[PDB]
Design a protein around this ligand. Structure first.
Ligand SMILES: Cc1ncc(COP(=O)(O)O)c(C=N)c1O
Ligand SMILES: Cc1ncc(COP(=O)(O)O)c(C=N)c1O
Ligand SMILES: Cc1ncc(COP(=O)(O)O)c(C=N)c1O
Ligand SMILES: Cc1ncc(COP(=O)(O)O)c(C=N)c1O
Lengths: 386, 386, 386, 386
């Protein structure tokens, strides 16, 4: 049949893959090669980036996002830069959300302008700010959603109409949702990018990225962006592992989301916790938008602990099961305290303008028994807050 | 001791590597992870791209090229672009050899100018052309040597002095030589780049690149170029395989060079072969320069077969052992006929301005018995030339 | 803490694993080495099979089965033979279930007797037959449950008491259940073995086995059985993949079992299906025993289609989503018709004595949407049965 | 053509391998699968162990040893036991060399007799002892050569004639030579086995074994020995790495042998060294036999240091480049002192009956510059011997 006709779990398992024609091997073979051979001069000319393993991953993700074609990359950052460096040149303009991944922010704020490409940062939770910042030279509107670190949302369908009316493309980073929870292209986005490093692979052992969009664009991203600009090839072994990890995407996302809701409710009920940011809680500022745009509220939670900086340090130093790390989207529950860890070299007043308060903790909820995670949190919080 | 003190074969085997401290495992473990964990908030802050497997490869190649530091990449193209996009910005200028890898040529001729970065192409076999093209805005001189497809040479030491006098850096693509045959940094180059896809890995199963240079530069290439521009990470599995492949670099290069000399002499003696391009033959235009600059003449050969385009096609369609492919630097002998294969979509008169004649064949000599390769060639040539 | 204290899902994720001490890498490093180095002669003597990756897998499975120690092997068959060849010698006796894996049957019926080791086969669904077959020389009672191909059950606790009273050990093949659905050691078995090739790895890309039991036994299985008899080492890469696959064991088993129940009910309601064998259906002969012994009824189903041999062939030749294969326990739904496929070289009357009727179909239910599987089955059945 | 027609280096590179038919991939794909799918019931029956990657390795090694067929295994020990447990049953007899690998000795001395299989150990350097020990029940003569730890030799051709005249098969462990240095089947042996863990893989990152012999035997070793007895499957990833490692077998063996000869001569000239055992030295007891039977004398050396046990300890504790390890046949130079390390739990007088004197050092010479190894040895010896 055609894999675009089956239910979503069936697509997760099967799309882009088939038993090996010549051997019947069911697993996609790892084509760990750099060299492909021709049968003849003619065969070689006719042919005149490409690998069967990576192709299977690209086709699968294209199906899952409901896009025409996929392109794998060496990293999520390379998926973002290959895309934007393919689309933009000296004199072009980009309108970007402000609440985005920090390294994306550095690329947009420092790298692009040095190539003659200007960027305007706006609060993408306010579509009007996006409209106001558009220019005749604007090629791209770039957004992330949910956005960290307070899990605020962006109304993709609305922003898409705005960008399109002014002749720009919409690019959406769908990393934190995965195709299982959100499909930006179905809401009008033109291009979706992911760090597969997170939920798509899910097993914390692959760095990689993926871009999905129209065939016309993807061909340019491949034959110019990858080939002639970033060189950000995904290795066939990484692609194989990502295919393997993605087989369980549906069941992992269900369990991540189930666990995260329970933990979020526990945190909301806890007197030592001042705030809890999780789209699955009714008290969330854009709760209804989230209900329409996302099939599930996700596995990521942020929260503020009473007592600011020192409480945040005490709490992370007191967990026994949760692991301290800056990654998110793995099978293990991961936790971090940006102010004391990643952003301590930053000015307190400046961190605040990023939405990073001294007491903010970020939590990636894993596949453990939620009771064990809650017990670990409860224990650490109690220790941290007297 | 210090691995920088041992003979070159000893460095090939040992540099950058040591038994695993905690387990004693001799092979460098494959750290196939995306997540690293901290023991504490303090430990996490202190720390504030990086992987132990990839680090071992980078350190090894730094030792072999006699440079301070190494940086692995997703591909040879990404080693080149990460380097040049790190060094250059809008308004800057590059002077480049014309006889370079085609995809490098596309990046330099089309991508860079679209970012406000101008490139002048020159015949790098003539150092005076390099000097003449220098401008106040010139940041970089870029060269490849030997250069394809006629294996002409560039006098690295001379070009280095010229670039430096005018305040530019010299970047050298050392792919076709490997550190075993040529060390550009010892001749004055500031930065060396490789596609490890060729001889450094040597086994035709890895796409990857490496950059070697001063610590100050490599840090910028890593924390800005890779992190904030190309995203061209090498996967830890690729790094492991490359470490494994490089263990035999010395013995592979010796045998490649021994075999190539024998085949080159056979070809030079053959009445159906009009020209043979191989630095190891005295008849080579820059033979003496090659003798001073290269420890060995290399494994790559180009030659012209009598009867132009159709003879070239006939010959490649008649080999039985040599494999038709556009790659070079593997254990198997590889052969290609650019005019009928890769460059047939190109204009005959334009190909010529690239140095690609209708009868030009390129040969990557592998580890087979040279007698078998010669027999295969002799058979194919005879068939091709009546 | 101690991983034996956490809930079962938490153990699945965490048991046997921890971030790498020296680097903090969260994924267990792949120690793909054959060589370990000593710091000194003394250090080498003190030390006087073993690999850190494989150790992590062995420790994890030991925790999940509630046994003292684990031992990984090159295959499920090697887990079984390493165990039994470690325990038994010339003149010893084994009492075995008759309804076991065919290749196990061949080892027991032909190999063992040629080594002076006698085996009596019995219907293990009848504990009295086990007792009756015991001899003074009986070292081992061996059983599988559920047993194929009709998914009949064996009362582990009862058989354990019988074997022990007569001084024998009980060995249980727990492949079809996994530790998530059944824990034989908690019911009195002394040793559990698995083909990890099925549910424990779950991704159809690893052949391997595991043995769990007391430390005293496992040491003998390791230093004599593996080292001095079968040589059935698991490679560290296989162990790594198995660790990776097992991370999702809980969520995979839940979904396999949920899907299988739905499909089993559909089949039971279908007029072209004469019988359906699935422990989750009340109509199953040992339903209550299954309820006490198994947390879930499993992902495997057998059923008989109307019209015997030719109907069975027609049906398997008519599925479009289910894949034809002799494996079971993967993410994809797999189907087979033993009589027309694997057992067609066998005598019809003999197949019957194995419980293989002409219309028997075996189904391994995967992670696809159950609706899609049911539609595929419904379509194939209808075609097969007019 | 037919790969059995090319020179030996050409076979090393090419035999058993070809570009992937469907994709043209030159590297043998890693078929990391446990599941193979059928197109139909008929196709499934017709078919009624096997993996395309492993098949390529088996075919290659069969070509290199000039045997009909190959069978890969989980380890060298499993290659030996799968072979002998396939050939022998209760009441059968084996005549074995005494100077063999210790773990082989344990299998033969303890395991086999417990299965009703008797073994007689003899000094295989004396063919007459082999003849004298033959019985009507003798199925197999088993030998290793060179034999450790004094590198004594066995005259394969002579022993083969003796075994055959009395109706037995000759099995030869060719691990220390590799097919590049010795081909037992060409000298009359019926079956060759290797630990590929040593020179065939060569990179110290694979444990595995291989068996080569007639198709009739190999089929039994595969479908009964592996399938129904040891279960000692080689994983497809291990097979791929072994194929990769073997590509450089010719050039590695040449360099190992060149380096070992230089080191052996240095040691023979050294006044603190009492004896040096290396077939490449004229002073070797069976020098001429070695010249006829072996193309090269090998990479392994044993020697005795003045001052017995304590000198041996001092010397190994004083090397700075050589690595202490019990492995041999890697790219790094490895060294060990059996008496102080591996065999210190053994009785001094008993070690001697094994040929292990207190001063015996074993050295596996790697690919480093021989000058560096010699300097390291010279330094350690001097320190060790005042
Ligand atoms: C929302 C988001 N987008 C992109 C990236 C970059 O993806 P990498 O380069 O694969 O790490 C990250 C960070 N992982 C992220 O959190
Ligand atoms: C001299 C030279 N430099 C760089 C490259 C690019 O290296 P890749 O991206 O790893 O293929 C090539 C082509 N392989 C080349 O021949
Ligand atoms: C119940 C059962 N036990 C053991 C085995 C053997 O395990 P392999 O050697 O890893 O295939 C099988 C068959 N896979 C089986 O179905
Ligand atoms: C001559 C010889 N034969 C067989 C073996 C066993 O091979 P493994 O099981 O792959 O280690 C060894 C020891 N490596 C050996 O030295």
């Amino acid at each position: 049949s055609d894999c675009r006709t089956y239910g979503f779990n069936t697509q997760i398992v099967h799309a882009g893959q088939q038993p090996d024609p010549s051997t019947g091997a069911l697993s996609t073979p790892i084509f760990q090669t750099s060299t492909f051979v021709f049968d003849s001069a003619e065969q070689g000319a006719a042919r005149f980036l490409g690998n069967p393993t990576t192709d299977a991953l690209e086709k699968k993700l294209a199906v899952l996002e409901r896009g025409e074609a996929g392109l794998a990359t060496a990293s999520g950052i390379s998926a973002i830069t290959t895309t934007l460096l393919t689309l933009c040149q000296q004199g072009d303009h980009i309108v970007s959300a402000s609440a985005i991944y920090g390294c994306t922010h550095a690329f947009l704020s420092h790298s692009m302008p040095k190539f003659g490409i200007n960027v305007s940062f706006v609060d993408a939770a306010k579509p009007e700010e996006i409209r106001a910042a558009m220019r005749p030279e604007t090629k791209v509107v770039y957004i992330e959603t949910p956005a960290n670190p307070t899990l605020s949302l962006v109304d993709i369908e609305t922003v898409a109409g705005i960008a399109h009316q002014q002749g720009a493309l919409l690019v959406v980073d769908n990393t934190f949702m995965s195709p299982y929870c959100q499909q930006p292209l179905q809401l009008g986005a033109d291009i979706v990018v992911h760090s597969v490093t997170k939920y798509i692979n899910g097993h914390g052992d692959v760095i990689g990225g993926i871009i999905v969009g129209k065939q016309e664009f993807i061909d340019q991203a491949r034959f110019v962006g990858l080939k002639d600009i970033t060189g950000g090839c995904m290795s066939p072994f990484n692609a194989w592992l990502t295919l393997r990890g993605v087989k369980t995407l549906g069941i992992r996302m269900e369990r991540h989301c189930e666990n995260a809701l329970k933990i979020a409710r526990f945190l909301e009920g806890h007197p030592s916790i001042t705030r809890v940011y999780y789209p699955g809680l009714s008290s969330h500022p854009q709760y209804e938008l989230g209900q329409r745009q996302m099939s599930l509220p996700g596995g990521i939670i942020s929260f503020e602990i009473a007592g600011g900086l020192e409480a945040g340090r005490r709490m992370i130093n007191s967990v026994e099961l949760c692991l301290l790390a800056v990654s998110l989207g793995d099978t293990e529950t991961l936790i971090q305290h940006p102010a004391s860890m990643t952003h301590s070299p930053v000015a307190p007043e400046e961190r605040l303008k990023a939405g990073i308060t001294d007491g903010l903790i970020r939590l990636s909820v894993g596949l453990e028994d939620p009771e064990d995670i809650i017990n670990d949190l409860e224990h650490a919080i109690r220790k941290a807050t007297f």
